[PDB]
């Protein structure tokens, strides 16, 4: 939409919105990230602190597959199974606790986030946190490990 922009309204004005005195030319202060320690330093601190220097160990050839674990915390733990079975087990027959394996839902580690409902579960995961292992044992649940 060339119609709607600032250059059709700035037409007739002498210096096209850039000034008589500064008179915008080509590249007044360098190209790109030039001068980040010299004359653009006050920009690079207060908006980019930490931009300059080594900070850690080098790890050649990392693979983003060995370090792979998605995490569910316990608020989204009952949305991994159907709504038919969070209410099926609760209506007081026996201690029949449903399974919830997170690993066919796309998750490896189970984390903690409170308000788990008072139903017993068994939960299959590869990893746990020490909060998540005891929010589940707080409602009479079991924390079964898989590999």
């Amino acid at each position: 939409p060339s119609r709607l922009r600032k250059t059709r309204k700035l037409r007739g004005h002498v210096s096209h919105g850039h000034g008589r005195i500064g008179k915008h030319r080509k590249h007044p202060g360098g190209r790109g990230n030039a001068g980040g320690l010299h004359h653009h330093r006050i920009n690079f601190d207060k908006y980019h602190p930490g931009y300059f220097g080594k900070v850690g160990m080098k790890h050649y050839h990392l693979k983003r597959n060995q370090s792979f674990c998605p995490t569910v915390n316990l608020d989204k733990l009952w949305t991994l199974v159907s709504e038919q079975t969070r209410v099926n087990a609760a209506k007081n027959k026996t201690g029949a606790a449903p399974i919830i394996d997170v690993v066919r839902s796309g998750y490896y580690k189970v984390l903690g986030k409170g308000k788990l409902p008072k139903q017993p579960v068994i939960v299959k995961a590869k990893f746990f946190s020490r909060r998540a292992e005891e929010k589940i044992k707080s409602v009479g649940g079991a924390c079964v490990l898989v590999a």
């Binding site: 590249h27 007044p28 202060g29 360098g30 690079f44 908006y47 693979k63 060995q66 066919r104």
Partner: protein, 103 residues
């Protein structure tokens, strides 16, 4: 040259990138071209199944993907041993063979 709070960006355009540009204007015309190459091949092997041989069951390697099952390249030459069909007769009946595969 910069200004107030924004990203600090590294655009990779410091090279003669306008001679190496790829425009996908033929990409409709290559989709109907490779459809016709599927249709004219499907009736050339007319009774045989389209998309060729049977492929094996293969579990993906990594920590990220070893929960899932994938089509493979071919059968390991010991399946054809145990299932009892010859390896030079397997590919002419419609069975993909991969001799470098270990079970």
């Amino acid at each position: 040259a910069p200004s107030r709070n924004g990203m600090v960006l590294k655009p990779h355009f410091h090279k003669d990138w306008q001679r190496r540009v790829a425009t996908w204007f033929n990409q409709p015309a290559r989709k109907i071209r490779r459809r016709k190459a599927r249709q004219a091949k499907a009736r050339r092997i007319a009774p045989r199944p389209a998309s060729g041989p049977i492929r094996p069951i293969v579990r993906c390697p990594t920590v990220r993907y070893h929960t899932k099952v994938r089509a493979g390249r071919g059968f390991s030459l010991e399946e054809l041993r145990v299932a009892g069909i010859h390896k030079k007769v397997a590919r002419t009946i419609g069975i993909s063979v991969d001799p470098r595969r270990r079970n």
